[PDB]
UniProtKB/Swiss-Prot annotation, chain A:
The gene is MRPL48. Belongs to the mitochondrion-specific ribosomal protein mL48 family. This is Large ribosomal subunit protein mL48. It comes from the Eukaryota. It comes from Homo sapiens. The modification N6-succinyllysine is found at K130. One of its GO terms (cellular component) is mitochondrial ribosome.
From Swiss-Prot, chain B:
One of its GO terms (molecular function) is RNA binding. Belongs to the mitochondrion-specific ribosomal protein mL40 family. Ubiquitous. Transmembrane segments: none annotated. It comes from Homo sapiens (Human). Component of the mitochondrial large ribosomal subunit (mt-LSU). Mature mammalian 55S mitochondrial ribosomes consist of a small (28S) and a large (39S) subunit. The 28S small subunit contains a 12S ribosomal RNA (12S mt-rRNA) and 30 different proteins. The 39S large subunit contains a 16S rRNA (16S mt-rRNA), a copy of mitochondrial valine transfer RNA (mt-tRNA(Val)), which plays an integral structural role, and 52 different proteins. mL40 binds to the major groove of the anticodon stem of mt-tRNA(Val) in the central protuberance. The gene is MRPL40. It is found in: Mitochondrion. GO terms for cellular component: mitochondrial inner membrane; mitochondrial large ribosomal subunit; mitochondrial ribosome; mitochondrion; nucleolus; nucleus. GO terms for biological process: anatomical structure morphogenesis; mitochondrial translation. This is Large ribosomal subunit protein mL40. It comes from the Eukaryota. Keywords: Mitochondrion, Ribonucleoprotein, Ribosomal protein, Transit peptide. The chain holds residues 76 to 198 of 206 of the full protein. Its main location: mitochondrion. Residues 93-117 are annotated as: Disordered.
From Swiss-Prot, chain C:
The gene is MRPL46. This is Large ribosomal subunit protein mL46. The modification N6-acetyllysine is found at K168. It comes from Homo sapiens. Its main location: mitochondrion. It is found in: Mitochondrion. Component of the mitochondrial large ribosomal subunit (mt-LSU). Mature mammalian 55S mitochondrial ribosomes consist of a small (28S) and a large (39S) subunit. The 28S small subunit contains a 12S ribosomal RNA (12S mt-rRNA) and 30 different proteins. The 39S large subunit contains a 16S rRNA (16S mt-rRNA), a copy of mitochondrial valine transfer RNA (mt-tRNA(Val)), which plays an integral structural role, and 52 different proteins. mL46 is located at the central protuberance. It comes from the Eukaryota. The keyword ATP-binding does not apply. GO terms for molecular function: structural constituent of ribosome. GO terms for cellular component: cell junction; cytosol; mitochondrial inner membrane; mitochondrial large ribosomal subunit; mitochondrion; nucleoplasm. Belongs to the mitochondrion-specific ribosomal protein mL46 family.
Swiss-Prot record, chain F:
This is Large ribosomal subunit protein mL55. It comes from Homo sapiens. Signal peptide: none annotated. The gene is MRPL55. It is found in: Mitochondrion. Belongs to the mitochondrion-specific ribosomal protein mL55 family. Component of the mitochondrial large ribosomal subunit (mt-LSU). Mature mammalian 55S mitochondrial ribosomes consist of a small (28S) and a large (39S) subunit. The 28S small subunit contains a 12S ribosomal RNA (12S mt-rRNA) and 30 different proteins. The 39S large subunit contains a 16S rRNA (16S mt-rRNA), a copy of mitochondrial valine transfer RNA (mt-tRNA(Val)), which plays an integral structural role, and 52 different proteins. The modification Phosphoserine is found at S50.
Amino acid sequence: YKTKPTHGIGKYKHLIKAETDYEYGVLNIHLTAYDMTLAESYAQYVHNLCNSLSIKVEESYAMPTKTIEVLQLQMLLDSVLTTHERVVQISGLSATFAEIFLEIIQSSLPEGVRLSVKEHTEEDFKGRFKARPEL
Amino acid sequence: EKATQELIPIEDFITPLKFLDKARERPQVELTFEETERRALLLKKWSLYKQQERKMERDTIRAMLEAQQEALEELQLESPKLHAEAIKRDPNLFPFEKEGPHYTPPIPNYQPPEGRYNDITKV
Amino acid sequence: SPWRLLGALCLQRPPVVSKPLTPLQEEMASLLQQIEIERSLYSDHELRALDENQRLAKKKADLAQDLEDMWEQKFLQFKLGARITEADEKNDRTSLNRKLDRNLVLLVREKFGDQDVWILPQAEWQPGETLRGTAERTLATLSENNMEAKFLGNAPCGHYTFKFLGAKVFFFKALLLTGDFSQAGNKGHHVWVTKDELGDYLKPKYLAQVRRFVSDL
Amino acid sequence: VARKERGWRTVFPSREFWHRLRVIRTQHHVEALVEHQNGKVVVSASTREWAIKKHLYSTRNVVACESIGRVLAQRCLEAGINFMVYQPTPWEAASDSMKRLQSAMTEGGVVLREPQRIYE
Amino acid sequence: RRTPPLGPMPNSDIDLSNLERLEKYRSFDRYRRRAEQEAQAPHWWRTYREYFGEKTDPKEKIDIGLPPPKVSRTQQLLERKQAIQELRANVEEERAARLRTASVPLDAVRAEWERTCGPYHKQRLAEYYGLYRDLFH
Amino acid sequence: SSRASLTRVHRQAYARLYPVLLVKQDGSTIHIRYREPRRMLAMPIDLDTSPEERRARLRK
RNA sequence: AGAGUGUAGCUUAAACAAAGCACCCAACUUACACUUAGGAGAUUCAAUUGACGCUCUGA
């Protein structure tokens, strides 16, 4: 009851969420590789170590894969390969901490991988949706 | 513009229509007791190995962090502006690109056969 | 109060070849391959193989093998790259060919009036400059060849002092993207080296702190 | 004839019992407590005890769970507690460990259903 | 009208100025454990305990009885470690545990229990049944 | 290092994916799991702006 | 060379004992997370007092 000292004992909305340098905007991490399983395992390791370091992770998603056909014209020969792309979004990594972060990532990086790390841009987000030609 | 843009389907999360045929099915060779025991022992040994790996990873990263912070606080005590200069970010360090290791090093003089490539993707 | 401030760069070359797996790692890899082939589903190869074997079985009462044999022969014909170089490990210690499995770092021949020491390159800092400035100044001075050493951080990584009067060097880290070994005749004996024989080589205790600081991995 | 605390329909533990079983399995040990609605224990069992731990391989496997169950059923029907109650979560009940535990207890001779209170 | 809170209000130790860094209850069981320990902790407001609890005196319960023997804890733990490591080194217990077929001698367990720590459990049972409060007041 | 490479195929209903070698333009070699039991694929080159260089590599 | 310190990573836990948390492998999960089923750990030595390890303070 309001008058009594027990007021406000039950409220929880202020606990739960309502809905310069050393402040790094939302960064994106692309991982391209021929092995979908290797890509997934590396992304899983990254997500687990991020959770361990208590660094925030917005979301992780897969970009549309793509298959490429290669043909040798000495005589005509054909072959095909696939390429898979994973993406992670992070934020809040400290300045000096980002150094060791990226360094450990590079060190534990396995073969058959290409990793890019950049600032999150609307271009990346709009490159996921179908390229509707009507517009 | 106000329409909810669709998302390109991922071909990895879509089982090919030609994967449900019942003609593929293989006979399943029942496992032996000793082989299953070997499998379980292998799994637990590898779990131990991985936890030791992450233990030494923790140690390395903690040592690196504490040493970096010692250097940082010494620089702060000595030069009260260069520590802020170091804490400042820098844009050229955000965009990185790197490759992974290789099963073998590049050959000094090796040319591949003459061919071309072509990407194939759908909406 | 005679002081002196130095900046230094430490480039870490990552290896290009995978580290040779532990026997346990290789055995569990074989086990994973076994489990994967056990749980796997049919592919076009298995389809055509089994179907044409059954076709042959039918025709007897009434190729994939050729392709895989040809592929095996092509594999045997082709030659792979070298991993370890016994000669280059000794006579070309100042080379990349000796070790492609683990990360590398260099060391320079430095001399001081008070004590001659085998240490990592450094340079003197002046006021109108950043420590990273001194770092790229040192690399541009001591490179003497075509190679770029890209940075990975602005924060300080090492702090090491010594008295005679007082000198204080701060170490930054950097990445090694390219590198050659031209101008082989040098005063400073630059040598790409790993942590083990680095520790075996050099004496100091500030350097021992460098040892425990640098990641072994 | 006693009165059990009927109510608390909104909260998960239903206090309408006389003797409750509470199982706590950690990542190191496993214990089972038979207590009264007062919150005061009447009998206990735990893998932490040396008598039970010396005979066992692991303090946390299904074997440990069913062994604690059998020992606790022995203690219960020694202490006269032939009826008792157990409020598990969905996954806690679906687990094979607790399933085999309660099966061991039932075959030991204790049912996890308490009689219906009398008064006419 | 308002009044100050007598005791320290709950959920006051946490900081809300920083909320995302904080760790969250990711398990009903964690929340339940927290709740049980909170409930067993005392509080200044009126609660279930001070109505439906026996209201045991805060003073000690007098018992001039047989004290425990002086057992050398060092060699006790040493022998226990020897026993547990011998058991772990044994070979059949692995398959026994991983196939869920093992058991234990009930008689031996009972004997070792009543020798080691039976008396405490029996004291608990007695004070439950009310023998002590009725006999020795 | 490379430790998270060897892994279980985190997917249900996966066809045969056998290990195979892949060679880039520089001769660098890597592993990739591929459908049929190949032994190596190789990446070719198509186009540079030098017309005389294109003609020379076509001759040789 | 001198000062401090000292339970597995954390906990001023210590009888009925080395407890709880943290952590790791596998499965579901796009992934994380939950959950299930499994995995390893220690108070350095002699009687709170000394002597083996740790940090700091000097050359």
